Every structure is written in C-alpha cells, then in structure tokens.
C-alpha cells in the first residue's frame, strides 16, 4: 500500500523488546499520528509536518546512537521521502498562465524576438513577460569595449614572440585578465564615486560617460542605442526589472546588481532574476533559444534512418518545419539537406497536408503542478534551467532562491575582503582562494573548488562557477533540500532518477533548436586555444 505507515505500523516495525518508549520516540509517534489527521490541511502544511517527523527521527538516532530501533527508523525515513513524492504527484494546482523570458544588459536581437513569437502564436491564453533593465542597456557594450581593447593590448606584447612556445593560450588569457581586472576596478571605483556624488544617476548614465572618457565613444550614439533598445523591447512584451518591487526589495537584488554592474555577467544576473520572477508570479520560464513542443504524432509516418542520432533527427524535424512553413526566416537547413530525397519528400508531403501552425506546434494549455515543486528541463548532461515551471510561491522556488542567496553569502564573505586589498588579479585570486579553502570541508569541497574560480568566470577555459552559484547545482541542492527535509544542502548525492521526479515533459519544449545547439559550445581548453589562435590571425594580418 502506497500510503505512509500509520502510528500502529511504525510502533510494530520500530519495536524493540525490553526497551521502554523514550520521550524522543513518543514524539515521533505523536507527530506521525498528527500527520494522518491532516487530510484537510494544505500541501505545504503536510510537507512541514513530514519535515517535523524527519527532524524528530534524526534527534532520536543522534540521542541513542546504539538503539535497536535505529534500523527501522532509517527505513521509516525512506518512507517519508516516498510520501513527499506521493504528496507532490497527488495534489496539483493550476499554473498561472505566464511565460517569462529575460533579456538584460543590451538590445534584444531579431532571432530572440522570432523565437518568442512562436510561443506567442500558439499560446494566446498566456501573458508574456520579456524582462529587461531600463537602467542598464549599455553593460554589454561596456564589457565588449573593455575586453576587445584588452585583447588588442595583450597581443601587441606577443609581437616578437609569435614562434615562442611559452606564448601559448594560457599566457594569453592570464595576461589579458590582468588588464580586464584593472579596468573592472577602475570602472567600479568610478561607479561608486559617481553614486555618492549624485544618487539620481542610473547605471547607463555612468557607463556612457565612462565610455566617452575612457574609450572616446560618442554619447550621442550611445543615447541613440539606448532609445532604440528601449523601443524594441517595450514593443515586444518588455517588463522592466526597475518596476519589479518585490525583487528590488529582496535579498537577491544586490546579487543581481553585483553580477550586472561589477562582474558584467549577464548570464548570472539572468539566473538570479528568472527564479525570483517565477517565485513571485508563477508560470513558465524559458530561454529565448527554446521553441514550443512539436505535436507528438506529427512525423509518425516518417521513421528515422539508421545513419543519424536522436539529436540529428530532432534538429531535422525543426529544420523541415522552417524550410516549408518559413515560420522563422533564415533558419538553418544544414541537417535537413543531408537527408535522402525520399525522406525530404516525406517531410514536404506531411507538412503540405497541414494548414495551421497549431497542427505543427503544441500549446501549453491548462498546466498544473504541486505547490511543493519547480519543474525543470533536462538534456543529455542533466537538469538545465533553460526551462522552468512553477506555481506562484512554490515551496521549491523559495528553496532555490535561498540556495542562491546562501551560495553568494559564502562567496562574498571571502571575496569582498580579498578585493578590498586592492591588489592585482593574480594576488587577489590567491588571497581569495586561500580564504575559501580555510572554510572547505567534506560537505562543500567540490563547490568551494569552483567558487575559487569566480573571478575567472567568462574569461578563462574550464570555469563552472556560475552553474555552482546561480545555475543547475543550486536547483539540485534545492531538490535535495526538499527531499531531505532540510535547507542549505551543499553535497549533492541525488542522481538522475531522483531529479527526474521534477522533469518538464518533453512534449512541452523543443530544445534542439538552431540557437540552442550552437550555444552548447563549452568553453574548454581546446576552444580557448582555438579562440587565441583566431585572435592572433586577425590581429597580425598583414604583418
């Protein structure tokens, strides 16, 4: 029977002859009995009761480390976990009909708009938010300007050493960062001084003057870009972060601004915003490179040739749609054009027999989920926060937000003092890592390892800090928090099968899109070497 054991059942299994019932044991039985009388309570209340039961059980095992009932109580703890999943699957509430996209730090491009429009076209019953920051359209411009200039400065120092094997990609990225870090410090010191002098100044005011003073950019041209950026986003369901009061007043806002203003990491700032948006409003978050799910039975008459993978086939399906329906102009066909004419004709025939977009892409419709959960997309590498589904104020959305805040607290506790010493990049790194390592233990070891690379994020190969800070790891940790009836998990022991309990159905997203499959590029050593080599070729052309 799937239902959680009752008091009498627990008494039997946790029975030890000749042992009196301790106060700590009775407490468990009492709470278990209370749980079974809670049929009229809310899901969250039921969960909190289960949490209390687990806590009381842990207190017993810790108090009487030798007790004969520990074996049975450990089995009981397993039953509690199963009950959480049962509670999750059996009590569903409607998901608010909102689609959330995020595009901050610069002008939204046409490709993003075209993808978003696909969702709009088949989900007319959904409100669409494309979150942007009206104060910070120039952050990407700033980063690109600083980085490009730094690349060019660095390569000039390589001029007489191009055949020297010591002047490798490693040296390049190291030397480049010395310059980038110095500029980042210069900028943030300027930002802080400007804010002190005139608190009415917004990010873009300070950035544009900085760009004019430091890199001879024209304020007039930057003003035009801001205007064009604002107009483009507001005409495409723009939702300004600067009007998101709950976000601005919460404990995540300073983390958002840390990433936006100090680190110029738009991906990380997006990570922080998206889950706060989902928590506060409810609905479905999507990356702008996701497309609506294909109708399940659309291509059932076409079977896959043996000379191609599932990933090749999935990409081909979308490319066929875009070739013959032209929903997105300029969509690739490189995978479709590799097929035999017999199957290309098979695609053309199927799609010709279809009239409306609603016959090709499915609609999200009435969705429901547990008040406990956030659902997440999966790819071949595991969970990925490119797709999220949650009811407003779901327990897990709260757990995820808290995971991210706690991770940043650990980071900033060591990072801020390190930075404040006002040394160069390498010295700051060493100070920071030494500080982080002093707080490392068996529980947080792998996490702390990645944290130590924070300042390298986006500028060096083999850096996974973001996923550990604001990305998938924080989500896995929240799921562990839920299933282990705790908060602040650092050591992820959950595996795929555990996480699949929270998966978004494959029918609800097309993940194998042109934009996505191009962004599965991983910045590893090989990629870094190739990038260095491309930079050198461009830079030294002529002689």
């Amino acid at each position, epitope marked *: 029977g799937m239902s959680l054991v009752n008091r009498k059942q627990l008494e039997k299994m946790a029975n030890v002859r000749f042992r009196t019932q301790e106060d700590e044991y009775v407490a468990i039985l009492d709470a278990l009995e209370e749980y079974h009388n809670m049929s009229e309570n809310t899901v969250v209340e039921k969960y909190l009761k289960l949490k209390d039961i687990n806590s009381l059980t842990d207190i017993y095992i810790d108090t009487y480390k030798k007790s004969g009932r520990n074996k049975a109580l450990k089995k009981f703890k397993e039953y509690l976990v199963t009950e959480v999943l049962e509670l999750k699957n059996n009590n569903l509430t409607p998901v608010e009909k909102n689609l959330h996209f995020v595009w901050i730090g610069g002008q939204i491009n046409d490709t993003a708009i075209n993808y978003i429009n696909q969702w709009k076209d088949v989900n007319s019953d959904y409100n669409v938010n494309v979150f942007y920051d009206s104060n910070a359209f120039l952050i990407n411009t700033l980063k690109k300007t600083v980085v490009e200039s730094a690349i060019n*400065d660095t*390569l*000039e*120092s390589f*001029r007489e050493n191009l055949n020297d094997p010591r002047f490798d990609y490693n040296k390049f990225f190291r030397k480049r960062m010395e310059i980038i870090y110095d500029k980042q410090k210069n900028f943030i010191n300027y930002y802080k001084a400007q804010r002190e002098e005139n608190p009415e100044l917004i990010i873009d005011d300070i950035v544009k003057t900085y760009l004019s003073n430091e890199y*001879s950019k024209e304020i007039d041209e930057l003003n035009t870009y801001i205007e064009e950026s604002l107009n483009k986003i507001t005409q495409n369901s723009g939702n300004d972060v600067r009007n998101f009061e709950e976000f601005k007043n919460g404990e995540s806002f300073n983390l958002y601004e840390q990433e936006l203003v100090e680190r110029w990491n738009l991906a990380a700032a997006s990570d922080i915003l998206r889950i706060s948006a989902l928590k506060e409003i409810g609905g479905m978050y999507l990356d702008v490179d996701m497309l609506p799910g294909i109708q399940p039975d659309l291509f059932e008459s076409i079977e896959k040739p043996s000379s191609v993978t599932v990933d090749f086939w999935e990409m081909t399906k979308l490319e066929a749609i875009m070739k013959y329906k032209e929903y997105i102009p300029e969509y690739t066909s490189e995978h479709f054009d590799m097929l035999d004419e017999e199957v290309q004709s098979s695609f053309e025939s199927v799609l010709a027999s279809k009239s409306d977009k609603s016959e090709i892409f499915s609609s999200l419709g009435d969705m429901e989920a547990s008040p406990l959960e956030v659902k997440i997309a999966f790819n071949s590498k595991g969970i990925i926060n490119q797709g999220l589904i949650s009811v407003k104020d779901s327990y897990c959305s709260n757990l995820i937000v808290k995971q991210i805040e706690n991770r940043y607290k650990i980071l900033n506790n060591s990072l801020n003092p390190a930075i404040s010493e006002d040394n160069d990049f390498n010295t700051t790194t060493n100070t920071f890592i030494d500080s982080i390592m002093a707080e490392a233990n068996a529980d947080n070891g792998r996490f702390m390892m990645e944290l130590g690379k924070y300042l390298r994020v986006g500028f060096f190969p083999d850096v996974k800090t973001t996923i550990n800070l604001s990305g998938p790891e924080a989500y896995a940790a929240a799921y562990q928090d839920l299933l282990m009836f705790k908060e602040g998990s650092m050591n992820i022991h959950l595996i795929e099968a555990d996480l699949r309990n929270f998966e978004i159905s494959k029918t609800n997203i097309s993940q194998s899109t042109e934009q996505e499959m191009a962004s599965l590029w991983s910045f590893d050593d090989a990629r870094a070497k190739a990038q260095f080599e491309e930079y050198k070729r*461009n830079y030294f052309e*002529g002689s």
Partner: nanobody
Amino acid sequence: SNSQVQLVESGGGLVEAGGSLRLSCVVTGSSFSTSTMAWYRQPPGKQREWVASFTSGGAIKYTDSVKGRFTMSRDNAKKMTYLQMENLKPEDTAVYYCALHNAVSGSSWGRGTQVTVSS
C-alpha cells in the same frame, strides 16, 4: 581584414641625412579607440619590417634601430597617428605603412608613403 576601415598615410618624400620628417595617417571607421596602431616600413630589396606601435591601452614600443630617434603618437578623437622621425639616416629609406590591428573586427593597412634619405 576589415573592409570598413581605411587608412591614408602622408608626409613622405626626399629628406637630407640628419633631417626630420613627420608622417601622418588618418583612419576611418569605429574601431580606432579599441585597436592597436602600428607603423611599418619596407626598405628597397628587403622585406617589410615593424617600426613602432601604440596600443589603445596607451603602451608605446619601438624597433631597436629607431629608439631615441622616432616618436609615435595617436589621437582617438581625430582618429590619427603620427610618426615623428628625427636624425634620419640613409638606412631609413623605405615605404612606410600604417596599420590598425584588431583581433575582433580585423586589421587594415594603408598603401604607404615613400621616404628617401639622401647620402
């Protein structure tokens, strides 16, 4: 190479040994302020050689044979670079070219300006 960037060098000619000469280069396009500017020269019979560079970060370098004699400058507002040559020697005779170097948007070169030093 970046086709949207053009460079026009000027100021070359015939000059006496020990004399001074200033070359100029005007640059078009929008990459000047984030690029490195460089001067080169191709002496008769020999391959083109590097002379001087001035990075967008403000670093100046010179080839050894020219140190103490040549002065390179750059002006982001005017999008111009200059090579001031002093105490000119016969071995300085060459076609002098200017280049904008950019790893991101690409590099562009001028067609050069000839300098002949008498002796």
